[PDB]
Design a protein around this ligand. Sequence first.
Ligand SMILES: *[C@@H]1O[C@H](CO)[C@@H](O)[C@H](O)[C@H]1NC(C)=O
Ligand code: NA
Lengths: 216, 219
Amino acid sequence: APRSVDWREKGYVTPVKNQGQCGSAWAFSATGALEGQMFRKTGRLISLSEQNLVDCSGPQGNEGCNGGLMDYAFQYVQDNGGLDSEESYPYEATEESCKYNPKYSVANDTGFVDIPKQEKALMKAVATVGPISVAIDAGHESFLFYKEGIYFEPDCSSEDMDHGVLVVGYGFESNNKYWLVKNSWGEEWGMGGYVKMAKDRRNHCGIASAASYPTV
Amino acid sequence: PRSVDWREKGYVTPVKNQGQCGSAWAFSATGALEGQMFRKTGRLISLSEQNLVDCSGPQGNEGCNGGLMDYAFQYVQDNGGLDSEESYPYEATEESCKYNPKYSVANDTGFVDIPKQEKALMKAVATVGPISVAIDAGHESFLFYKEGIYFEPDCSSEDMDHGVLVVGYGFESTESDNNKYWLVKNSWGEEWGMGGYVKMAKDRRNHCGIASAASYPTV
Ligand SMILES: *[C@@H]1O[C@H](CO)[C@@H](O)[C@H](O)[C@H]1NC(C)=O
Ligand code: NA
Protein backbone atom coordinates (compact mmCIF):
# COMPACT_ATOMS: atom_id res chain seq x y z
CA ALA A 1 0.00 0.00 0.00
CA PRO A 2 2.94 2.40 0.51
CA ARG A 3 3.11 4.98 -2.27
CA SER A 4 6.79 4.42 -3.04
CA VAL A 5 9.10 1.47 -2.67
CA ASP A 6 12.74 1.13 -3.60
CA TRP A 7 14.61 -2.04 -2.72
CA ARG A 8 18.04 -0.85 -3.84
CA GLU A 9 17.93 1.65 -0.98
CA LYS A 10 17.19 -1.29 1.33
CA GLY A 11 20.23 -3.26 0.14
CA TYR A 12 18.39 -5.97 -1.82
CA VAL A 13 19.87 -5.31 -5.24
CA THR A 14 23.35 -5.87 -6.74
CA PRO A 15 24.93 -3.45 -9.22
CA VAL A 16 23.88 -3.54 -12.86
CA LYS A 17 25.40 -6.32 -14.92
CA ASN A 18 25.74 -6.82 -18.68
CA GLN A 19 24.43 -9.89 -20.49
CA GLY A 20 26.45 -9.11 -23.64
CA GLN A 21 25.21 -10.39 -27.00
CA CYS A 22 23.96 -13.57 -25.31
CA GLY A 23 20.18 -14.00 -25.04
CA SER A 24 20.38 -14.73 -21.32
CA ALA A 25 18.26 -11.93 -19.82
CA TRP A 26 16.07 -14.61 -18.28
CA ALA A 27 19.08 -15.55 -16.12
CA PHE A 28 19.90 -12.05 -14.91
CA SER A 29 16.25 -11.50 -14.08
CA ALA A 30 16.20 -14.78 -12.13
CA THR A 31 19.44 -14.11 -10.21
CA GLY A 32 18.20 -10.62 -9.40
CA ALA A 33 15.08 -11.99 -7.77
CA LEU A 34 17.00 -14.68 -5.90
CA GLU A 35 19.62 -12.16 -4.74
CA GLY A 36 16.72 -10.19 -3.28
CA GLN A 37 15.22 -13.16 -1.45
CA MET A 38 18.58 -14.38 -0.13
CA PHE A 39 19.22 -10.89 1.26
CA ARG A 40 15.87 -10.93 3.08
CA LYS A 41 16.79 -14.29 4.61
CA THR A 42 20.46 -13.82 5.52
CA GLY A 43 21.06 -10.07 5.36
CA ARG A 44 24.00 -10.76 3.06
CA LEU A 45 23.82 -9.57 -0.53
CA ILE A 46 25.82 -11.94 -2.75
CA SER A 47 25.94 -11.60 -6.53
CA LEU A 48 24.78 -14.88 -8.10
CA SER A 49 26.02 -16.80 -11.13
CA GLU A 50 23.99 -16.34 -14.30
CA GLN A 51 26.48 -18.60 -16.04
CA ASN A 52 25.58 -21.39 -13.61
CA LEU A 53 21.99 -20.96 -14.83
CA VAL A 54 22.86 -20.70 -18.52
CA ASP A 55 25.11 -23.79 -18.46
CA CYS A 56 23.16 -26.06 -16.13
CA SER A 57 19.42 -25.39 -16.26
CA GLY A 58 18.68 -27.02 -19.62
CA PRO A 59 16.92 -29.98 -18.04
CA GLN A 60 14.35 -27.60 -16.56
CA GLY A 61 13.61 -26.24 -20.04
CA ASN A 62 16.04 -23.33 -20.43
CA GLU A 63 17.94 -22.86 -23.69
CA GLY A 64 21.07 -20.94 -22.65
CA CYS A 65 21.87 -17.93 -24.84
CA ASN A 66 18.84 -18.78 -26.98
CA GLY A 67 16.40 -17.92 -24.19
CA GLY A 68 14.65 -19.33 -21.17
CA LEU A 69 12.33 -18.48 -18.33
CA MET A 70 12.81 -17.13 -14.83
CA ASP A 71 10.52 -19.90 -13.47
CA TYR A 72 12.71 -22.61 -15.02
CA ALA A 73 15.73 -20.99 -13.33
CA PHE A 74 14.01 -21.03 -9.93
CA GLN A 75 13.11 -24.68 -10.49
CA TYR A 76 16.71 -25.54 -11.36
CA VAL A 77 17.91 -24.01 -8.10
CA GLN A 78 15.37 -26.13 -6.18
CA ASP A 79 16.18 -29.34 -8.06
CA ASN A 80 19.90 -28.64 -7.88
CA GLY A 81 19.82 -27.66 -4.20
CA GLY A 82 22.06 -24.66 -4.79
CA LEU A 83 23.61 -22.01 -7.03
CA ASP A 84 27.18 -20.71 -7.17
CA SER A 85 28.26 -17.13 -6.54
CA GLU A 86 29.03 -14.77 -9.42
CA GLU A 87 32.60 -14.69 -8.11
CA SER A 88 33.15 -18.46 -8.19
CA TYR A 89 31.34 -18.91 -11.52
CA PRO A 90 31.86 -15.81 -13.68
CA TYR A 91 29.82 -14.69 -16.69
CA GLU A 92 31.24 -15.65 -20.12
CA ALA A 93 28.33 -14.52 -22.30
CA THR A 94 28.27 -17.91 -24.04
CA GLU A 95 26.92 -21.36 -23.24
CA GLU A 96 29.43 -23.93 -22.04
CA SER A 97 29.13 -27.24 -20.18
CA CYS A 98 27.92 -27.25 -16.59
CA LYS A 99 30.51 -26.45 -13.91
CA TYR A 100 28.28 -26.29 -10.84
CA ASN A 101 30.36 -26.86 -7.73
CA PRO A 102 28.34 -27.44 -4.54
CA LYS A 103 31.23 -26.19 -2.38
CA TYR A 104 30.66 -22.68 -3.77
CA SER A 105 26.87 -22.57 -3.48
CA VAL A 106 25.55 -19.46 -1.76
CA ALA A 107 21.83 -19.71 -2.54
CA ASN A 108 18.91 -22.10 -2.24
CA ASP A 109 15.26 -21.90 -2.96
CA THR A 110 12.21 -23.75 -1.90
CA GLY A 111 9.83 -23.07 -4.77
CA PHE A 112 8.54 -20.07 -6.66
CA VAL A 113 5.38 -18.06 -6.99
CA ASP A 114 3.78 -16.74 -10.15
CA ILE A 115 1.91 -13.46 -9.77
CA PRO A 116 -1.31 -12.76 -11.68
CA LYS A 117 -1.07 -10.56 -14.80
CA GLN A 118 -2.40 -7.49 -13.01
CA GLU A 119 -0.57 -4.29 -12.13
CA LYS A 120 -2.31 -4.21 -8.74
CA ALA A 121 -0.98 -7.70 -7.95
CA LEU A 122 2.53 -6.75 -9.04
CA MET A 123 2.33 -3.66 -6.83
CA LYS A 124 1.45 -5.74 -3.77
CA ALA A 125 4.23 -8.21 -4.46
CA VAL A 126 6.84 -5.52 -5.00
CA ALA A 127 5.73 -3.67 -1.87
CA THR A 128 5.85 -6.85 0.17
CA VAL A 129 8.31 -9.38 -1.12
CA GLY A 130 11.30 -7.73 -2.75
CA PRO A 131 12.51 -7.36 -6.34
CA ILE A 132 10.26 -9.31 -8.72
CA SER A 133 11.21 -10.98 -12.02
CA VAL A 134 9.06 -9.93 -14.98
CA ALA A 135 9.35 -9.96 -18.77
CA ILE A 136 8.82 -6.82 -20.82
CA ASP A 137 8.69 -5.74 -24.45
CA ALA A 138 12.22 -4.47 -25.05
CA GLY A 139 12.06 -4.55 -28.82
CA HIS A 140 11.40 -0.94 -29.75
CA GLU A 141 14.02 1.59 -30.83
CA SER A 142 12.87 4.12 -28.22
CA PHE A 143 13.71 1.56 -25.53
CA LEU A 144 17.10 0.86 -27.06
CA PHE A 145 17.85 4.57 -26.92
CA TYR A 146 16.22 5.21 -23.55
CA LYS A 147 18.05 7.66 -21.32
CA GLU A 148 15.67 9.19 -18.76
CA GLY A 149 12.04 9.78 -17.84
CA ILE A 150 9.00 7.54 -17.82
CA TYR A 151 9.00 5.11 -20.74
CA PHE A 152 5.65 4.34 -22.38
CA GLU A 153 5.30 1.07 -24.29
CA PRO A 154 3.95 2.29 -27.64
CA ASP A 155 2.11 -0.86 -28.03
CA CYS A 156 0.56 -3.65 -25.98
CA SER A 157 1.02 -7.26 -27.11
CA SER A 158 1.52 -10.47 -25.12
CA GLU A 159 3.89 -12.10 -27.59
CA ASP A 160 6.48 -9.32 -27.57
CA MET A 161 6.73 -9.20 -23.77
CA ASP A 162 9.74 -11.47 -23.71
CA HIS A 163 12.78 -9.69 -22.28
CA GLY A 164 13.44 -10.60 -18.63
CA VAL A 165 14.10 -7.79 -16.16
CA LEU A 166 13.79 -6.98 -12.43
CA VAL A 167 11.20 -4.69 -10.83
CA VAL A 168 12.98 -3.20 -7.81
CA GLY A 169 10.39 -0.58 -6.86
CA TYR A 170 7.78 1.95 -7.86
CA GLY A 171 7.02 5.59 -7.28
CA PHE A 172 5.66 8.76 -8.82
CA GLU A 173 7.27 11.73 -10.56
CA SER A 174 4.87 14.38 -9.35
CA ASN A 175 0.00 11.18 -10.82
CA ASN A 176 2.75 10.06 -13.22
CA LYS A 177 3.42 6.66 -11.68
CA TYR A 178 6.27 4.36 -12.66
CA TRP A 179 7.96 1.04 -12.04
CA LEU A 180 11.68 1.08 -11.25
CA VAL A 181 13.20 -1.53 -13.51
CA LYS A 182 16.71 -2.97 -13.52
CA ASN A 183 17.89 -4.12 -16.97
CA SER A 184 20.92 -6.26 -17.86
CA TRP A 185 22.42 -4.19 -20.66
CA GLY A 186 25.23 -2.70 -18.57
CA GLU A 187 25.38 0.65 -16.83
CA GLU A 188 25.74 2.67 -20.06
CA TRP A 189 22.17 1.86 -21.09
CA GLY A 190 19.29 3.98 -19.82
CA MET A 191 19.66 5.62 -16.43
CA GLY A 192 22.77 3.76 -15.29
CA GLY A 193 21.12 0.56 -16.48
CA TYR A 194 17.68 1.33 -15.03
CA VAL A 195 14.39 2.44 -16.60
CA LYS A 196 11.22 4.02 -15.23
CA MET A 197 8.26 2.29 -16.85
CA ALA A 198 4.84 3.92 -16.91
CA LYS A 199 2.58 2.42 -14.24
CA ASP A 200 -1.20 2.03 -13.73
CA ARG A 201 -1.58 3.29 -17.21
CA ARG A 202 -5.22 3.89 -18.15
CA ASN A 203 -5.08 1.97 -21.43
CA HIS A 204 -5.07 -1.13 -19.38
CA CYS A 205 -1.63 -2.61 -20.01
CA GLY A 206 0.53 -3.96 -18.53
CA ILE A 207 4.03 -5.13 -17.69
CA ALA A 208 2.91 -7.80 -15.22
CA SER A 209 3.48 -10.33 -18.02
CA ALA A 210 5.33 -13.32 -16.57
CA ALA A 211 5.84 -11.98 -13.05
CA SER A 212 7.33 -14.29 -10.41
CA TYR A 213 9.73 -14.70 -7.51
CA PRO A 214 11.43 -17.60 -5.69
CA THR A 215 10.48 -18.74 -2.21
CA VAL A 216 13.32 -19.30 0.23
CA PRO B 1 45.58 -5.04 -11.68
CA ARG B 2 44.68 -2.82 -14.64
CA SER B 3 41.00 -2.51 -13.82
CA VAL B 4 39.66 -2.15 -10.29
CA ASP B 5 35.95 -1.81 -9.51
CA TRP B 6 34.84 -2.04 -5.90
CA ARG B 7 31.14 -1.95 -6.80
CA GLU B 8 31.40 -5.42 -8.32
CA LYS B 9 33.04 -6.60 -5.10
CA GLY B 10 30.16 -5.38 -2.93
CA TYR B 11 31.84 -2.35 -1.37
CA VAL B 12 29.56 0.41 -2.64
CA THR B 13 25.97 1.40 -1.78
CA PRO B 14 23.64 2.86 -4.44
CA VAL B 15 23.93 6.49 -5.52
CA LYS B 16 22.45 9.00 -3.08
CA ASN B 17 21.38 12.62 -3.64
CA GLN B 18 22.62 15.48 -1.45
CA GLY B 19 19.93 17.84 -2.77
CA GLN B 20 20.55 21.59 -2.47
CA CYS B 21 22.59 21.17 0.70
CA GLY B 22 26.37 21.64 0.47
CA SER B 23 27.09 18.30 2.12
CA ALA B 24 29.06 16.34 -0.50
CA TRP B 25 31.73 16.00 2.18
CA ALA B 26 29.35 13.85 4.22
CA PHE B 27 28.38 11.56 1.36
CA SER B 28 32.04 11.10 0.44
CA ALA B 29 32.87 10.17 4.04
CA THR B 30 29.96 7.73 4.40
CA GLY B 31 30.88 6.10 1.08
CA ALA B 32 34.45 5.53 2.23
CA LEU B 33 33.32 4.23 5.61
CA GLU B 34 30.67 1.98 4.02
CA GLY B 35 33.52 0.42 2.05
CA GLN B 36 35.80 -0.22 5.01
CA MET B 37 32.98 -1.51 7.20
CA PHE B 38 32.20 -3.95 4.38
CA ARG B 39 35.84 -5.00 4.16
CA LYS B 40 35.72 -5.71 7.89
CA THR B 41 32.31 -7.28 8.45
CA GLY B 42 31.05 -8.40 5.04
CA ARG B 43 27.83 -6.52 5.79
CA LEU B 44 27.12 -3.48 3.64
CA ILE B 45 25.03 -0.95 5.58
CA SER B 46 24.10 2.52 4.35
CA LEU B 47 25.30 5.20 6.76
CA SER B 48 23.69 8.43 7.94
CA GLU B 49 24.90 11.64 6.29
CA GLN B 50 22.37 13.56 8.36
CA ASN B 51 24.14 12.28 11.49
CA LEU B 52 27.34 13.81 10.08
CA VAL B 53 25.68 17.06 9.01
CA ASP B 54 23.91 17.56 12.36
CA CYS B 55 26.61 16.36 14.76
CA SER B 56 30.19 16.91 13.48
CA GLY B 57 30.38 20.66 14.00
CA PRO B 58 32.82 20.24 16.86
CA GLN B 59 35.25 18.45 14.55
CA GLY B 60 35.19 21.48 12.23
CA ASN B 61 32.34 20.68 9.85
CA GLU B 62 29.76 23.28 8.84
CA GLY B 63 26.79 21.12 7.89
CA CYS B 64 25.20 22.35 4.67
CA ASN B 65 27.80 25.08 4.19
CA GLY B 66 30.69 22.66 3.77
CA GLY B 67 33.10 20.45 5.68
CA LEU B 68 35.83 17.86 5.19
CA MET B 69 35.76 14.07 5.05
CA ASP B 70 38.61 13.88 7.57
CA TYR B 71 36.50 15.84 10.05
CA ALA B 72 33.69 13.34 9.46
CA PHE B 73 36.04 10.44 10.17
CA GLN B 74 37.29 12.18 13.30
CA TYR B 75 33.73 12.69 14.53
CA VAL B 76 32.95 8.98 14.11
CA GLN B 77 36.07 8.19 16.14
CA ASP B 78 35.28 10.76 18.83
CA ASN B 79 31.59 9.84 18.90
CA GLY B 80 32.27 6.10 19.04
CA GLY B 81 29.59 5.38 16.44
CA LEU B 82 27.51 6.48 13.47
CA ASP B 83 23.83 5.74 12.84
CA SER B 84 22.50 3.86 9.81
CA GLU B 85 20.85 5.78 6.98
CA GLU B 86 17.60 3.98 7.87
CA SER B 87 17.58 5.05 11.52
CA TYR B 88 18.68 8.63 10.80
CA PRO B 89 17.32 9.70 7.39
CA TYR B 90 18.67 12.47 5.14
CA GLU B 91 16.71 15.73 5.13
CA ALA B 92 18.98 18.04 3.13
CA THR B 93 18.97 20.63 5.92
CA GLU B 94 20.93 21.12 9.14
CA GLU B 95 19.08 20.44 12.39
CA SER B 96 20.09 19.64 15.97
CA CYS B 97 22.06 16.46 16.70
CA LYS B 98 19.95 13.36 17.23
CA TYR B 99 22.59 10.64 17.38
CA ASN B 100 21.31 7.60 19.24
CA PRO B 101 24.02 5.09 20.18
CA LYS B 102 21.54 2.19 20.18
CA TYR B 103 21.41 2.61 16.40
CA SER B 104 25.13 2.73 15.65
CA VAL B 105 26.29 0.48 12.82
CA ALA B 106 29.80 1.79 12.15
CA ASN B 107 33.00 2.65 13.98
CA ASP B 108 36.31 3.95 12.97
CA THR B 109 39.72 4.15 14.44
CA GLY B 110 41.05 7.21 12.67
CA PHE B 111 41.97 7.84 9.06
CA VAL B 112 44.90 7.85 6.65
CA ASP B 113 45.67 10.84 4.45
CA ILE B 114 47.23 9.95 1.10
CA PRO B 115 49.83 12.19 -0.57
CA LYS B 116 48.58 14.13 -3.61
CA GLN B 117 50.28 11.85 -6.12
CA GLU B 118 48.11 9.96 -8.61
CA LYS B 119 50.33 6.93 -8.01
CA ALA B 120 49.76 6.96 -4.25
CA LEU B 121 46.02 7.26 -4.91
CA MET B 122 46.22 4.41 -7.42
CA LYS B 123 47.89 2.17 -4.82
CA ALA B 124 45.25 3.03 -2.21
CA VAL B 125 42.36 2.42 -4.61
CA ALA B 126 43.99 -0.86 -5.68
CA THR B 127 44.58 -2.00 -2.14
CA VAL B 128 42.23 -0.43 0.41
CA GLY B 129 38.81 0.11 -1.14
CA PRO B 130 36.85 3.18 -2.18
CA ILE B 131 38.71 6.40 -1.37
CA SER B 132 37.44 9.86 -0.41
CA VAL B 133 38.76 12.71 -2.51
CA ALA B 134 37.67 16.18 -3.56
CA ILE B 135 37.37 17.34 -7.16
CA ASP B 136 36.53 20.49 -9.09
CA ALA B 137 32.83 20.14 -9.89
CA GLY B 138 32.20 23.77 -10.82
CA HIS B 139 32.22 23.54 -14.60
CA GLU B 140 29.13 23.47 -16.79
CA SER B 141 30.36 20.41 -18.68
CA PHE B 142 30.64 18.56 -15.36
CA LEU B 143 27.05 19.60 -14.59
CA PHE B 144 25.79 18.25 -17.91
CA TYR B 145 28.06 15.21 -17.92
CA LYS B 146 26.32 12.06 -19.13
CA GLU B 147 28.93 9.58 -20.39
CA GLY B 148 32.50 9.03 -21.57
CA ILE B 149 35.73 10.38 -20.15
CA TYR B 150 35.55 13.72 -18.38
CA PHE B 151 38.52 16.07 -18.73
CA GLU B 152 38.97 18.77 -16.09
CA PRO B 153 39.48 21.87 -18.25
CA ASP B 154 41.94 23.60 -15.93
CA CYS B 155 44.08 22.72 -12.92
CA SER B 156 43.35 24.79 -9.83
CA SER B 157 43.82 23.61 -6.24
CA GLU B 158 41.37 25.99 -4.56
CA ASP B 159 38.53 24.88 -6.84
CA MET B 160 38.87 21.18 -5.99
CA ASP B 161 36.40 21.29 -3.13
CA HIS B 162 33.58 18.85 -4.00
CA GLY B 163 33.94 15.59 -2.08
CA VAL B 164 33.34 12.37 -4.03
CA LEU B 165 34.26 8.69 -3.87
CA VAL B 166 36.79 6.96 -6.13
CA VAL B 167 35.55 3.39 -6.44
CA GLY B 168 37.90 2.19 -9.16
CA TYR B 169 39.86 2.85 -12.30
CA GLY B 170 40.29 1.31 -15.74
CA PHE B 171 40.52 2.16 -19.42
CA GLU B 172 38.16 2.82 -22.31
CA SER B 173 40.08 1.56 -25.26
CA THR B 174 40.64 -1.88 -26.57
CA GLU B 175 44.13 -0.79 -25.60
CA SER B 176 44.83 0.29 -22.05
CA ASP B 177 47.67 2.54 -21.09
CA ASN B 178 45.41 4.69 -23.25
CA ASN B 179 42.17 6.47 -22.34
CA LYS B 180 42.58 5.74 -18.62
CA TYR B 181 39.95 6.92 -16.11
CA TRP B 182 38.98 6.90 -12.44
CA LEU B 183 35.50 5.63 -11.64
CA VAL B 184 33.96 8.27 -9.38
CA LYS B 185 30.69 8.07 -7.44
CA ASN B 186 28.96 11.44 -7.14
CA SER B 187 26.16 12.41 -4.73
CA TRP B 188 23.92 14.17 -7.23
CA GLY B 189 21.42 11.32 -7.54
CA GLU B 190 21.12 8.70 -10.22
CA GLU B 191 19.93 11.10 -12.96
CA TRP B 192 23.29 12.88 -13.01
CA GLY B 193 26.02 11.42 -15.16
CA MET B 194 26.23 7.66 -15.74
CA GLY B 195 23.83 6.40 -13.08
CA GLY B 196 25.37 8.99 -10.75
CA TYR B 197 28.94 8.05 -11.67
CA VAL B 198 31.62 9.78 -13.74
CA LYS B 199 34.71 8.54 -15.53
CA MET B 200 37.47 11.04 -14.88
CA ALA B 201 40.54 11.39 -17.06
CA LYS B 202 43.41 9.57 -15.35
CA ASP B 203 47.18 9.67 -15.75
CA ARG B 204 47.04 12.80 -17.93
CA ARG B 205 50.05 14.28 -19.72
CA ASN B 206 49.60 17.77 -18.31
CA HIS B 207 50.15 16.11 -14.93
CA CYS B 208 46.93 17.44 -13.43
CA GLY B 209 45.68 14.87 -10.93
CA ILE B 210 42.48 14.56 -8.93
CA ALA B 211 44.10 13.19 -5.76
CA SER B 212 43.38 16.55 -4.12
CA ALA B 213 42.45 15.72 -0.51
CA ALA B 214 42.58 11.94 -0.57
CA SER B 215 41.87 9.79 2.48
CA TYR B 216 40.12 6.73 3.90
CA PRO B 217 38.96 5.78 7.40
CA THR B 218 40.64 3.05 9.41
CA VAL B 219 38.51 0.49 11.24
C1 LIG C 1 32.12 0.46 18.22
O1 LIG C 1 33.08 0.58 19.24
C2 LIG C 1 32.52 0.92 20.48
C3 LIG C 1 33.62 1.24 21.49
O2 LIG C 1 34.69 0.35 21.30
C4 LIG C 1 31.67 -0.25 20.95
O3 LIG C 1 31.15 0.03 22.23
C5 LIG C 1 30.54 -0.49 19.96
O4 LIG C 1 29.83 -1.67 20.29
C6 LIG C 1 31.08 -0.61 18.53
N1 LIG C 1 29.96 -0.50 17.61
C7 LIG C 1 29.96 -1.08 16.41
C8 LIG C 1 28.72 -0.92 15.59
O5 LIG C 1 30.93 -1.71 15.97
NA1 NA D 1 22.04 -26.79 -19.36
